[PDB]
Structure 1
Amino acid sequence: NQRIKEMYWKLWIDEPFNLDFDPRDVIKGKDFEITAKEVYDFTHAVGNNCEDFVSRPDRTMLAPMDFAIVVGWRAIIKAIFPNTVDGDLLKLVHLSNGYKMIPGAKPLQVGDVVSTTAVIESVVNQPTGKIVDVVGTLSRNGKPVMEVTSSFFYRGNYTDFENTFQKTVEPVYQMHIKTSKDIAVLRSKEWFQLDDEDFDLLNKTLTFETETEVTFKNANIFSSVKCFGPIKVELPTKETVEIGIVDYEAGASHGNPVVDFLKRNGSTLEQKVNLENPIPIAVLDSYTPSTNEPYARVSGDLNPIHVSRHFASYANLPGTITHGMFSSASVRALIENWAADSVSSRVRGYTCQFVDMVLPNTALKTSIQHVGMINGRKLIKFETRNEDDVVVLTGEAEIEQPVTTFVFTGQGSQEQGMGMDLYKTSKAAQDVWNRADNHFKDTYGFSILDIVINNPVNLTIHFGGEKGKRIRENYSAMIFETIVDGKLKTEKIFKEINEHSTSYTFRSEKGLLSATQFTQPALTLMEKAAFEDLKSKGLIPADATFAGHSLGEYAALASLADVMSIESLVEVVFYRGMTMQVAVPRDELGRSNYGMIAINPGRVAASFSQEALQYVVERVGKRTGWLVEIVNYNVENQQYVAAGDLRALDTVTNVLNFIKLQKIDIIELQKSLSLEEVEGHLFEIIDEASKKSAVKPRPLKLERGFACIPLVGISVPFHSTYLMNGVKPFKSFLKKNIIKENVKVARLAGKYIPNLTAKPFQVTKEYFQDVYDLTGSEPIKEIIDNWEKYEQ
């Protein structure tokens, strides 16, 4: 065996031959500077057609993950050499080879110098032989980029339990302390030592960065187990701090108590969801090459058994067996073409288990399947079978889904029985709905679930008993802090509700599911529940962007940001709803002289753009003396929603209908014919339109223009200047309800797209200044003035 290590050293290792080294001592491989030649040669050897690994000018030439062995192999194989790990290298089996790009590591560039480091974990003496699993940690610019995990096997009889050991870094486990017996359980646990013994654990999530060192006596008996690591708590800021230690030490153990605890009373950090049916991607025929020399030269794996007839024959192998890692890389390349959509960056990980042996010039067939997800990364199961109908290779491939931007639907889209099926079928759906339902019943004594299901016409709220008192209490709490002449004009909602009000009636014309204070919770609630179902399925990429239309923004930020909880969401969205219901004068029917028109700029005229309609609404609003503006810039020159006065909507509809009937453009006549003529010539059209619009009663029906479409049942002018006065109370609410801690900038940063400023959420002096210009505010003006004081 020592001569066999010597000779494999000469063919493999480029160091001075000495096997006298500690396996437990971490191995450092020499820097391997990647070159575009070595990538090109390796890509042609493996048969990689991907454009990512082609040397195209301007763009930075990506590195195939397969090449990660060429850098690493030097250190990786080197782990099998020690006089501690004795065995014949000829009857060495490559069992499993795993590559995992650590999340945040961009794939290797062409000008990189990669630091190679390998550590020896799993030296287990099986009755069948000796399994050695070694962890190769590869780093660029000091930061780890990928992990190279290799499991190797010595065939024979290894009763070497003295130097047998297991040094696994046990996964972290979160433990939610809701009940009083749970803290009783952890305090009953001897190994749970705290920094401060008095530390309250109630409503806390405790993580254990625990790792276990086991020395063996037998194949199952562990001669000594040392399971230890720091116990941290998730703080309200969601920073982690060490509050205790696990320092479990025992002798003749048959297993770990902590692991048994965890499989009954511990929850794994990561679960890989399953699809009902594995999606059939493809079944692709791989073929081994006539010679392994073009792969062996680039790879540096100079085991003659792959090339040498005489070696293969001495080893009882049926021929010069093709490099398994060759066929592995060849099959991933097919995963990259088919399941990575011809992208190298979409690969996270790739594990390949070599089951059977493969010879040169064989007709393999690879059955690929899309089986699963895990936190936005698709799970791909591939198996490789030979002509003999024998499965030779297995493997799993975690693949990142690309950028998926979310758009959350606003109001008007509400219907009866919306999201009922999902409410029955999904667990997370049930949980969202039930949580929001319980909040509404304990807080405001109504079932939003009742209202979405059946939509009562009128809904009574009875303050009849002890329960009725706590409901009525907060029904006096909501107010309008409206700004009128610089002084707070506080208007409480439901002036009728007082200390001697026993019952109030929510009154709708057709059904209370139409009134915005019930649309907004219902819409938002369903969307949240649906997204929680998507997250329980793990189908949401973490790189995703997200925006909303009017109301949807609140649903989008609640979902993708988790800035405000379900009880926070419902209270703020219901506050919005009633704050926009009672920001306008209404009647018994809840009819206000306000609404919206979705205007098609191309319909009135193709040459009619969005700067022409912005001029038309700016001139109509001043000439009429009514209030209307553009509130939603939906599609460029195809749909602009204008909210304002019902007479102001009707006159603008008449103006744009007459302009289309006359077939005259305002942009041609203003710049090309006469200057400041179409201004006084527009005011006669606006007069003509406004005199007919005003005559019609205050509850006038909104009718469809040739460009314009009437938003049905929009009493409120949402996003209009009309409710700029209602901003002062809403901000006063938002500061009380959104918390310092609960905002996570990184999870917001470049991901949340606000409706005011359609620029990714960024915390920089330029973005605050852009917000201050777009709408002046004393907090952000103060912050930009005092910017350099918050940095230090």
Structure 2
Amino acid sequence: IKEMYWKLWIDEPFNLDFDPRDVIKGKDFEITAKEVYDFTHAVGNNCEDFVSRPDRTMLAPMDFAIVVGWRAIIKAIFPNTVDGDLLKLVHLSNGYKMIPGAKPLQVGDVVSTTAVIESVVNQPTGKIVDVVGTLSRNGKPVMEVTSSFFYRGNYTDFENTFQKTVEPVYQMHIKTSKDIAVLRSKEWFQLDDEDFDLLNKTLTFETETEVTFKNANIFSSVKCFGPIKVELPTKETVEIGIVDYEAGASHGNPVVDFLKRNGSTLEQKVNLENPIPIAVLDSYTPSTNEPYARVSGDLNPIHVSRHFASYANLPGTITHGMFSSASVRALIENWAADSVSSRVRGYTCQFVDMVLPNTALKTSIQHVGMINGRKLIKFETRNEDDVVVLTGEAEIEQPVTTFVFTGQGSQEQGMGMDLYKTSKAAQDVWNRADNHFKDTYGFSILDIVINNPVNLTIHFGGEKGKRIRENYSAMIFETIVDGKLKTEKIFKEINEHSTSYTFRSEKGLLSATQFTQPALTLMEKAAFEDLKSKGLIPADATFAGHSLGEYAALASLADVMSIESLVEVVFYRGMTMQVAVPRDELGRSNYGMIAINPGRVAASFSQEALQYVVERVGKRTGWLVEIVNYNVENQQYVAAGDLRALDTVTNVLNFIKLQKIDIIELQKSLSLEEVEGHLFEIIDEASKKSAVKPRPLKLERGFACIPLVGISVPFHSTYLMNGVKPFKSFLKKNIIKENVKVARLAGKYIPNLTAKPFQVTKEYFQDVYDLTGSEPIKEIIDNWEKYEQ
């Protein structure tokens, strides 16, 4: 029987004398528009990605892997040492999985196949053969095909049997010192450094188990290996140890038993609350199976020849299962992936029953769950008699996603305390940060957020309290003001002989910069961690934060800082935006910022027009004003500096609206570079009208400009380029080199400085230097030949 199927399937000399344990290789197979045409027409995949179109590259469907992979995957059920009546064979399951990264199969491509036999086990009712094909182009893996076949019969051949399973990832929280001792008991718990402290760490065991057999029940050899990892404070895991269990005769794997009881499983697949119906769809099987057989190369006679079908006791020439796979995945690709081939990312199909030609299949389709922010889509196909025929699932990529993180101003009492009640992941973020604040700075950020306290006194009593006072006394502000840097120590009212410090606000502390900054940055980081927990975060998400967002976004999607390091930085930031401006009277500053709406002044008035008016009013007056937030085009900007120079601008603008001069009509059209004179007139009347008022002057609104209330510092301006050298050397303590994953930034992070997706190239450093003038950056551009190690 195997001499026949070898003539029909394989194209080699007939030799059954090769080891199953060895690695089977296929021919180098070149994808061509001809074969992708013929294939897609045989399955009914009328998806545009596979059709030749002008000025476009023709993709091949992922189904087409089995076309490439067959010669090799099927060659795994032939060896002498896996004896089987090939007429009685049953293809049980088939699976595709794109390796994360690599793009789908193109029409130019030359695809190398390699199949490996994973697991040959004699069950009571027959022999199961799990095979794994790996498709590689330009010497990189592209996808994995996972077919499982089943020889029906009665086998007692346990010498030629084996099973490599990959166990679920097990997680242990080490709380006590007996937990650590029970683990040191186990010979199979190797550690790279045996002195490593395990206490309060979280361990993950990533374990595969190879297992030869003696009988159905007794393994003649067990092996269970793969790395032990510890969760760091970023939530990144790192290899500390090995599992290295071996054994002869054994009735079980003691490692996986130990970790089932003592640990708990890290299930990647997270179920939705309730399934979401997508479609209930109707496909026919084709009258003949000679079309599919030609294109695939499955010339199994039971599909085409009434004699072989009868000789194998089938109800007739049956439809190839691998046709019903493709047919059904063309409906998944069309409804769930809205006709984008590249979105469907893995696909897995169990062949429950048989289907004859001209049957009519109802396939229900549901969104059931999420897995690393691919959708998880269970289907099931029924014939006319309401019998299940296929089942399976698809992993479908969510549409291209950007996460944007709101900055300050939006803060409210009770913010994200809804999530805190419900979410285990949110709870871990607040609780983690509220313990850090309680112990280093003597307040609870939760209390602040939950009940807006008007006043908040820290006391520095007991030994704990003296430690907490050193933590305020150490907080400086290494300003670069004057030729020589001057260090203005924050909290001047805190010395060896203090017992208290009190934070005053007018309205509530949650509106003060130094409490608002963390309360935002947490609320966000929590929301985000609850999403990540639910499996709702695409691997390839772009992210960006407005001002403070920048931090919450880099904590959330690149785990640069710990939760503890994050709230430090952000609290120091909000503090370093209070010392930054002089406030002689009390907390009033002679600085502020206004929100301009150029639309409202004049339909013509826009960009290149504000960037004159505001640049002149400051070149003229000598009073620092700047545009700081470029938000919406010709609809939202924010200017910030000298409350005087702001009061000129809200007047100068309220003049141009009521005066109703259209700038462009007299910008260049009428008089060219004379306008400086027209403008200098309009300034000097409003300039020296707002240079005689109650020092910290009540800044009034106007048709163009609204004033932002309670904003007393001009941030995102050159004013506090002076207070930077401190903050830059502060970050280099809380942001460590080891905790920066380039992969999680490059292409994905859009800075606020340089609104250009983060890259690490000479080009990008050069563009930063041009908007900064930093020496640590310039010295890198100078000797860019550290490219050589």
Normalising by structure 2, we get a TM-score of 0.95
1:348 Cα deviation from its structure 2 partner: 1.7
1:55 Cα deviation from its structure 2 partner: 1.6
Cα 1:77/1:546, change in 2 over 3 Å? same
Per-residue CA deviation, residues 705-737 of structure 1 (Å, 9 max, x unaligned), is 222222222122221222221112211211222
1:20 Cα deviation from its structure 2 partner: 2.0
- Distance in 1 (CA, whole Å) between partners of 2:619 and 2:787 is 43
Structure 2 partner of 1:66: 63
1:561 Cα deviation from its structure 2 partner: 1.2
- Distance in 1 (CA, whole Å) between partners of 2:511 and 2:196 is 50
Cα 1:740/1:243, change in 2 over 3 Å? closer
1:220 Cα deviation from its structure 2 partner: 1.9
Cα 1:224/1:789, change in 2 over 3 Å? closer
Cα 1:325/1:790, change in 2 over 3 Å? closer
Q: Any conservation in 2 of the 1:28–1:117 contact (CA below 8 Å)?
A: yes
Q: Any conservation in 2 of the 1:236–1:741 contact (CA below 8 Å)?
A: no
Moved more, 265-274 or 72-81: 265-274
1:227 Cα deviation from its structure 2 partner: 2.9
Q: Any conservation in 2 of the 1:509–1:589 contact (CA below 8 Å)?
A: no
Q: Any conservation in 2 of the 1:237–1:741 contact (CA below 8 Å)?
A: no
Per-residue CA deviation, residues 59-93 of structure 1 (Å, 9 max, x unaligned), is 32111100100111111111111222222222211
- Distance in 2 (CA, whole Å) between partners of 1:582 and 1:197 is 49
Per-residue CA deviation, residues 613-642 of structure 1 (Å, 9 max, x unaligned), is 011001112323322100011122221111
1:343 Cα deviation from its structure 2 partner: 1.2
Q: Any conservation in 2 of the 1:385–1:391 contact (CA below 8 Å)?
A: yes
Structure 1 partner of 2:186: 189
- Asked if 1:344 corresponds to 2:341, the answer is yes
| Structure 2 unaligned spans of 5+ | none
- Distance in 2 (CA, whole Å) between partners of 1:210 and 1:427 is 26
Per-residue CA deviation, residues 462-491 of structure 1 (Å, 9 max, x unaligned), is 113222211111111112211222212211
Per-residue CA deviation, residues 239-293 of structure 1 (Å, 9 max, x unaligned), is 9998765442222211111111232345556521111011111111121111121
Cα 1:222/1:52, change in 2 over 3 Å? same
Partner SS state of residue 344, structure 2: coil
Per-residue CA deviation, residues 659-689 of structure 1 (Å, 9 max, x unaligned), is 1112213333131222221102101111222
Q: Any conservation in 1 of the 2:120–2:129 contact (CA below 8 Å)?
A: yes
Q: Any conservation in 2 of the 1:22–1:82 contact (CA below 8 Å)?
A: yes
Q: Any conservation in 2 of the 1:105–1:145 contact (CA below 8 Å)?
A: yes
- Distance in 2 (CA, whole Å) between partners of 1:701 and 1:338 is 60
Q: Any conservation in 1 of the 2:170–2:263 contact (CA below 8 Å)?
A: yes
Cα 1:259/1:361, change in 2 over 3 Å? same
Question: How many correspondences in the alignment?
Answer: 789
Partner SS state of residue 469, structure 1: helix
1:141 Cα deviation from its structure 2 partner: 1.4
| Structure 1 unaligned spans of 5+ | none
Cα 1:228/1:530, change in 2 over 3 Å? closer
Cα 1:466/1:203, change in 2 over 3 Å? closer
Cα 1:209/1:115, change in 2 over 3 Å? farther
1:145 Cα deviation from its structure 2 partner: 1.0
1:337 Cα deviation from its structure 2 partner: 1.2
Q: Any conservation in 2 of the 1:384–1:393 contact (CA below 8 Å)?
A: yes
Partner SS state of residue 488, structure 2: strand
Structure 2 partner of 1:765: 762
Q: Any conservation in 1 of the 2:604–2:663 contact (CA below 8 Å)?
A: no
Q: Any conservation in 1 of the 2:234–2:562 contact (CA below 8 Å)?
A: no
Per-residue CA deviation, residues 440-472 of structure 1 (Å, 9 max, x unaligned), is 111111111111111011111111322221111
Q: Any conservation in 1 of the 2:640–2:714 contact (CA below 8 Å)?
A: yes
- Distance in 2 (CA, whole Å) between partners of 1:231 and 1:423 is 31
- Distance in 2 (CA, whole Å) between partners of 1:93 and 1:637 is 67
Moved more, 76-85 or 293-302: 76-85
- Distance in 2 (CA, whole Å) between partners of 1:320 and 1:218 is 37
- Distance in 2 (CA, whole Å) between partners of 1:360 and 1:315 is 17
Structure 2 partner of 1:643: 640
Structure 2 partner of 1:29: 26
- Distance in 2 (CA, whole Å) between partners of 1:275 and 1:693 is 60
Cα 1:468/1:546, change in 2 over 3 Å? same
- Distance in 1 (CA, whole Å) between partners of 2:752 and 2:650 is 26
Per-residue CA deviation, residues 362-397 of structure 1 (Å, 9 max, x unaligned), is 221111111111111111111111221222111011
Structure 1 partner of 2:96: 99
Q: Any conservation in 1 of the 2:628–2:716 contact (CA below 8 Å)?
A: yes
Once the two structures are superposed, the pairs formed by residues 167-186 of structure 1 within 5 Å of their partners are 167-170=164-167, 179-186=176-183
Partner SS state of residue 615, structure 1: helix
1:346 Cα deviation from its structure 2 partner: 1.2
- Distance in 1 (CA, whole Å) between partners of 2:729 and 2:238 is 33
1:12 Cα deviation from its structure 2 partner: 1.6
Structure 2 partner of 1:225: 222
Per-residue CA deviation, residues 212-261 of structure 1 (Å, 9 max, x unaligned), is 33221222221222334566778999999987654422222111111112
- Distance in 1 (CA, whole Å) between partners of 2:635 and 2:265 is 50
1:405 Cα deviation from its structure 2 partner: 1.0
1:181 Cα deviation from its structure 2 partner: 3.4
Cα 1:707/1:562, change in 2 over 3 Å? same
Cα 1:475/1:196, change in 2 over 3 Å? closer
1:594 Cα deviation from its structure 2 partner: 2.3
Once the two structures are superposed, the pairs formed by residues 36-55 of structure 1 within 5 Å of their partners are 36-55=33-52
Q: Any conservation in 2 of the 1:508–1:590 contact (CA below 8 Å)?
A: no
Cα 1:42/1:576, change in 2 over 3 Å? same
Identity %: 100
Partner SS state of residue 634, structure 1: strand
Partner SS state of residue 693, structure 1: coil
1:207 Cα deviation from its structure 2 partner: 6.7
1:588 Cα deviation from its structure 2 partner: 7.0
Cα 1:587/1:372, change in 2 over 3 Å? farther
1:172 Cα deviation from its structure 2 partner: 6.3
Per-residue CA deviation, residues 549-572 of structure 1 (Å, 9 max, x unaligned), is 111111111111111111101111
Cα 1:733/1:228, change in 2 over 3 Å? closer
- Distance in 1 (CA, whole Å) between partners of 2:262 and 2:694 is 68
- Distance in 1 (CA, whole Å) between partners of 2:365 and 2:328 is 9
Moved more, 708-717 or 584-593: 584-593
Cα 1:491/1:230, change in 2 over 3 Å? closer
Per-residue CA deviation, residues 564-600 of structure 1 (Å, 9 max, x unaligned), is 1111011110111011022122367633232222212
- Distance in 2 (CA, whole Å) between partners of 1:125 and 1:466 is 69
Once the two structures are superposed, the pairs formed by residues 117-136 of structure 1 within 5 Å of their partners are 117-136=114-133
Per-residue CA deviation, residues 73-124 of structure 1 (Å, 9 max, x unaligned), is 1111111112222222222111110111111221111111111111112111
- Distance in 2 (CA, whole Å) between partners of 1:381 and 1:233 is 34
- Distance in 2 (CA, whole Å) between partners of 1:166 and 1:621 is 77
Q: Any conservation in 2 of the 1:378–1:399 contact (CA below 8 Å)?
A: yes
Moved more, 416-425 or 777-786: 777-786
Per-residue CA deviation, residues 681-704 of structure 1 (Å, 9 max, x unaligned), is 101111222233333433444433
- Asked if 1:737 corresponds to 2:744, the answer is no
Structure 1 partner of 2:512: 515
1:536 Cα deviation from its structure 2 partner: 0.6
Partner SS state of residue 214, structure 1: strand
Structure 1 partner of 2:470: 473
Cα 1:548/1:198, change in 2 over 3 Å? closer
- Distance in 2 (CA, whole Å) between partners of 1:423 and 1:196 is 38
- Distance in 2 (CA, whole Å) between partners of 1:409 and 1:773 is 27
Cα 1:687/1:750, change in 2 over 3 Å? same
- Asked if 1:529 corresponds to 2:559, the answer is no
Cα 1:561/1:323, change in 2 over 3 Å? same
Cα 1:525/1:193, change in 2 over 3 Å? closer
Q: Any conservation in 1 of the 2:173–2:263 contact (CA below 8 Å)?
A: no
Partner SS state of residue 519, structure 2: helix
Q: Any conservation in 1 of the 2:373–2:538 contact (CA below 8 Å)?
A: yes
Per-residue CA deviation, residues 29-68 of structure 1 (Å, 9 max, x unaligned), is 1121111110111111111121211122333211110010
Q: Any conservation in 2 of the 1:118–1:135 contact (CA below 8 Å)?
A: yes
Cα 1:55/1:269, change in 2 over 3 Å? farther
Normalising by structure 1, we get a TM-score of 0.95
RMSD: 2.3
Structure 2 partner of 1:546: 543
